Structures are given as structure tokens and as C-alpha cells.
């Protein structure tokens, strides 16, 4: 997220992936989002092993 001032200079930026706060911050395109219940989708687990079966 790139915020610009009156002279086209970057003031603050959001990582969007550091934590849930970054995702909520760049979801509404605002540096400080308003008080609300924001949903963060895409939550899932990852595999920890690989099983291979053949003949």
C-alpha cells in the first residue's frame, strides 16, 4: 500500500502479509481502518509430509 502526500512523496506503507493487521490495513485502503469486524479469508494449513505409493 503506497500512501502519497500533497507533493507525491511516500509517507507510510503497509506490508499486507506481515500479520492480520497488515491485511486489514490494506483491505480497506486506509492507514488506520475504522472500528469493525474484518474477516481474513485464505486461512488454511500446509502439508508436513509427502507419501508416495507405487507398485
Amino acid at each position: 500500500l503506497l500512501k502519497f502526500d500533497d507533493r507525491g512523496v511516500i509517507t507510510n506503507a503497509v506490508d499486507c502479509s506481515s500479520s492480520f493487521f497488515s491485511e486489514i490495513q490494506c483491505k480497506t485502503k486506509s492507514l488506520l481502518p475504522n472500528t469493525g469486524v474484518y474477516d481474513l479469508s485464505g486461512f488454511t494449513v500446509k502439508p508436513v509430509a509427502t507419501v508416495h505409493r507405487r507398485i
Binding site: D39, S41, G42, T44
Partner: protein, 332 residues
């Protein structure tokens, strides 16, 4: 992020082109949910309009007045009404059907352990289709209904124009052209008749009934809509297959863009159609809530002079009890 594309980056990158569609979908779902929340809050507010309870009042101590039995209608016996306010009638209603908010929460909690696969809620929840619980639990609504009833029947009679229940019935019968001479002598008989009618409607849920049919109809309609929406993921939509894994593992990802685009377009079209019917049913339930608004405010706390509006015929009065996804009444 989970319906059209479950956990594939190749599918999530292409979703950026239709970001406005997903944003609009989330916005309309959030506003209809807020509308439902406002309607629920309005119902909870109208139940507590001008009601006044007594601290010394104990329904567990006194549970009978003027030879009228109402134990099956008043919940949380005693002044510790903070654990379970479900009355006997509400308990029977919630026992007939188990797909309430509590049942949904318990079903989702039971999905952690893989002890069952026949339940469709797990395959539905794993695909981004979840049923969130309402803002106010059914226990709070049940407590509100029993509080309104006990206040409308015991002093202070807030929802009875400051008149006792027996006198309220005796005066409501006079409005339908009756002689006051026979109402005084027929006191025990009218009380037994009222108790018999209450017991008849209480045990009348054994066989089929109109109320049970409507409750099962709305629950089954919601389940059918969810199943139809979930079944859309198994449509080829003119592609080689409906499984994203097979397409991603069979093609070289250079010509699979057209198949993925076709599947995405079909799923988005189905989503748009579903949210259209969603707005339609939201408007319908809002109108039903408005009907309940005037029905309660004009037939429970008082009796508006509207011929054949509350019940069907020579209406006397009505009561209110909690029901799953709605309200239930006793139109005597």
C-alpha cells in the same frame, strides 16, 4: 478466496481481474447481515417496550392464578434467570427440530475430530460456506418472551393495560357481543376450557402441523439452497473436468487459462444468481418481520379494533413464545 479457488495460487492470481465482483459480493452479504441484525434488535427492543418486572416476583413459588395453568409457558423458575430461560413449550419446539443456531454451532465444533463424514456441514464449511450464529442467542430471545408473558400476566400488568389476566379475558369476550351475566358464573368452566385449549395446542405437535411444516420448510429450503450452491463446483462448464487439481496436473498451465476462465466465469455467474435470490429472501423475511412487528404490537400488548386480523374469527387475545427463526402465537 475459498469458493472459486480453494488453495491454488494459479487460481488466486487470475481472481484479481474480478476483484470488484468479490468486493461487491462481500459488501452485499455484509449489508444483508446488518439488516438481519437490525431486525433482530428491533424485535428484542419491541419485546422490552414498556415492560416492568418485580424483584420480589418468583415464578417458582407462585405459578398459578385464577385457576389458570401457565407453567409450560414461563421459563427460568426463580430469580436466577441467567442459566436457561427456555420454558416447556419452547423446549418442545426446540426438541422437534435440531437445526437451530445451537445445533449449527455444535455441528461445526464436532468437525474437528474426523469421526463422521456423512455430515454435509463439514464439506460445506471447508469450501467457504459457513452459517454464522446470530447476534442474539435463542436463550436471550426465550428469556425476553417469557419476561414479556410473566409481566403481561402478573402485576404490574405492563402489556395488559394494568388489568389482571382473568379480567382481561372477561372484558375481551364482552367485545364480541356476549352477556356479562353468564361470564361470571362460568368462571371455572372458562378457566378449564382455556387450559384444555392450551394443552391441545401444546401436545398438537405430535402429528403434522402447519407451524412445524413452515419451520421444516424454511430449514430445508436453506439446506437445499446451500446444497445447490455447493453442487455447482462439480459442473464441467464446458471444460475437460470440474476438478481444478486434475486440470492443473494435466495441462501445461499455458492453455489451461481458458478452462480456468470458463470455470471461474460459471462459478461467478452462479454466485451472482445466488446473491440475487439472497437479496430476494432477505426482503421477504424483512417484510415478514414487519408483519410480526404490527402483529405483536397490536395483538399481544393490547387488542387493536381490527376485525379478523390477529386470529381467524371471533378473536379474543394472543400469547407469544419463542420459536426457531421466528415467533409463534396462541390465537385464542
Amino acid at each position: 478466496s475459498l469458493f472459486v479457488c480453494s488453495n491454488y495460487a494459479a487460481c488466486h492470481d487470475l481472481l484479481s481481474e474480478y476483484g470488484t465482483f468479490c468486493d461487491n459480493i462481500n459488501s452485499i452479504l455484509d449489508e444483508v447481515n446488518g439488516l438481519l441484525d437490525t431486525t433482530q434488535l428491533h424485535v428484542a427492543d419491541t419485546l422490552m417496550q414498556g415492560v416492568t418486572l418485580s424483584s420480589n416476583l418468583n415464578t417458582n413459588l407462585h405459578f398459578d392464578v385464577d385457576n389458570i395453568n401457565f407453567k409450560s409457558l414461563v421459563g427460568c423458575l426463580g430469580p436466577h434467570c441467567g442459566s436457561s430461560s427456555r420454558s416447556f413449550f419452547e423446549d418442545l419446539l426446540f426438541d422437534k427440530v435440531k437445526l437451530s443456531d445451537v445445533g449449527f454451532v455444535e455441528a461445526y465444533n464436532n468437525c474437528t475430530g474426523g469421526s463422521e463424514i456423512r455430515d454435509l456441514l463439514c464439506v460445506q464449511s471447508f469450501n467457504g460456506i459457513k452459517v454464522l450464529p446470530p447476534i442474539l442467542s435463542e436463550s436471550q430471545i426465550s428469556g425476553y418472551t417469557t419476561a414479556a408473558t410473566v409481566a403481561a400476566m402478573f402485576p404490574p400488568w405492563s402489556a395488559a393495560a394494568g388489568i389482571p389476566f382473568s379480567l382481561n379475558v372477561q372484558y375481551r369476550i364482552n367485545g364480541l357481543g356476549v352477556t356479562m351475566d353468564v361470564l361470571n358464573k362460568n368462571q371455572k368452566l372458562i378457566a378449564t376450557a382455556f387450559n384444555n385449549a392450551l394443552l391441545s395446542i401444546q401436545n398438537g405437535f405430535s402429528a403434522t402441523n402447519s407451524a412445524l411444516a413452515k419451520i421444516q420448510s424454511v430449514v430445508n429450503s436453506n439446506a437445499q439452497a446451500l446444497n445447490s450452491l455447493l453442487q455447482q463446483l462439480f459442473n464441467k462448464f464446458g471444460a475437460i473436468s470440474s476438478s481444478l487439481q486434475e486440470i492443473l496436473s494435466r495441462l501445461d498451465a499455458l492453455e489451461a487459462q481458458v478452462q480456468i476462465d470458463r470455470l471461474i466465469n460459471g462459478r461467478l455467474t452462479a454466485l451472482n444468481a445466488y446473491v440475487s435470490q439472497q437479496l430476494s429472501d432477505i426482503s421477504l423475511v424483512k417484510l415478514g418481520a414487519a408483519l410480526a412487528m404490527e402483529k405483536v404490537n397490536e395483538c399481544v400488548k393490547s387488542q387493536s379494533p381490527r376485525i379478523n386480523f390477529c386470529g381467524n374469527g371471533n378473536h379474543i387475545l394472543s400469547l407469544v413464545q419463542n420459536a426457531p427463526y421466528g415467533l409463534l402465537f396462541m390465537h385464542f
